[PDB]
Amino acid sequence: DMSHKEFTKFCYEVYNEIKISDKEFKEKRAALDTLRLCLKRISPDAELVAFGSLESGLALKNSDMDLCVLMDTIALQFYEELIAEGFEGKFLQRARIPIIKLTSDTKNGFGASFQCAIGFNNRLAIHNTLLLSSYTKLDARLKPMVLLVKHWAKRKQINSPYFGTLSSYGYVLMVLYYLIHVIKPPVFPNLLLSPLKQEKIVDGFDVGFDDKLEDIPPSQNYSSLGSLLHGFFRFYAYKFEPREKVVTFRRPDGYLTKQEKGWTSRYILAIEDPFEISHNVGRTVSSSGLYRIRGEFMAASRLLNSRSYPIPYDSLFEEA
Numbered sequence: 120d121m122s123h124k125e126f127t128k129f130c131y132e133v134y135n136e137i138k139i140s141d142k143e144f145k146e147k148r149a150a151l152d153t154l155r156l157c158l159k160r161i162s163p164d165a166e167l168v169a170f171g172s173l174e175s176g177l178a179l180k181n182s183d184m185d186l187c188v189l190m191d192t193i194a195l196q197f198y199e200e201l202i203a204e205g206f207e208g209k210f211l212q213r214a215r216i217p218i219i220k221l222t223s224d225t226k227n228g229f230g231a232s233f234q235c236a237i238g239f240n241n242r243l244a245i246h247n248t249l250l251l252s253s254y255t256k257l258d259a260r261l262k263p264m265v266l267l268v269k270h271w272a273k274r275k276q277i278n279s280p281y282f283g284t285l286s287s288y289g290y291v292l293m294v295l296y297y298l299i300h301v302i303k304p305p306v307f308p309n310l311l312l313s314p315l316k317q318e319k320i321v322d323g324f325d326v327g328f329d330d331k332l333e334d335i336p337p338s339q340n341y342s343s344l345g346s347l348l349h350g351f352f353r354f355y356a357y358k359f360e361p362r363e364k365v366v367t368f369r370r371p372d373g374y375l376t377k378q379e380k381g382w383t384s385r386y387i388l389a390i391e392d393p394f395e396i397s398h399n400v401g402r403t404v405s406s407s408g409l410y411r412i413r414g415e416f417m418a419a420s421r422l423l424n425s426r427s428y429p430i431p432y433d434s435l436f437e438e439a
């Protein structure tokens with residue numbers, strides 16, 4: 120595939136600038152080690168598990184850590200020890216879903232800008248990280264594609280779940296959906312729908328998937344990174360119908376209506392979590408938020424569709 124050679128070269132240049140460094144990666148590893156030791160002072164029966172982009176390898180520079188304490192009230196004891204240990208942070212006891220947010224470190228050398236969120240017994244988040252991790256190990260093109268889409272969403276201000284747009288995880292799912300169920304030949308098989316997948320029930324949901332990666336043959340898609348991204352932008356700009364359809368990993372042909380799903384009355388953008396199927400990852404998206412997201416997909420597509428010469432690829436990541 121030599122169709123997008125220039126754009127591809129540019130994609131890999133930006134990727135190398137935005138990906139987390141091995142140094143920052145090692146630092147967050149040491150932070151995790153330190154926090155684990157702190158938790159073991161509270162209880163021998165609790166474990167501290169990393170999830171999210173640092174664990175899957177899909178992290179941008181300066182990303183926050185996402186951690187989960189697994190057990191079986193420890194939250195408050197852990198919080199008190201962490202601050203006694205010189206971390207600074209926030210915690211709301213008895214909260215619906217307790218969360219410790221660490222915002223700084225004063226004694227442990229992890230920096231004044233050390234950011235870490237610690238949840239409790241969130242086994243589902245751990246399993247979707249396992250799934251994302253497997254896909255990143257399956258195809259070398261996935262990691263840069265995800266980072267570039269995340270970087271784009273951030274720069275275009277459409278990566279703000281608290282402000283009516285979409286979480287980073289939401290964009291990752293939109294990427295996987297495209298690579299599995301839209302692009303032909305597929306970049307990836309659907310690991311949940313594999314005939315080798317076995318059911319595994321956690322928290323009332325099936326988190327089973329075909330995880331024996333060595334038995335998965337290499338992709339029959341030979342598209343360059345640039346071609347994959349252009350295709351992804353065009354699908355969500357022009358083809359996907361968010362008023363009617365659900366991004367899903369539970370259908371062999373990837374086809375699912377909001378009607379059938381019963382997601383009709385927030386469901387402005389519908390993205391069904393692959394394990395917690397009752398959760399719409401896009402429920403933070405407002406009507407105005409979706410209009411801006413769609414607008415940005417069209418602009419990205421328009422830029423890349425250009426038959427003119429030298430294309431200003433930089434504008435893809437220029438702010439606003």
Ligand SMILES: [Br-]
Nearest residue numbers: 172287288291
């Ligand atoms: Br993610």
Ligand SMILES: [Br-]
Nearest residue numbers: 353354357358
């Ligand atoms: Br199209």
Ligand SMILES: [Mg+2]
Nearest residue numbers: 127128343344
């Ligand atoms: Mg290449």
Ligand SMILES: [Mg+2]
Nearest residue numbers: 418419434435
């Ligand atoms: Mg643009």
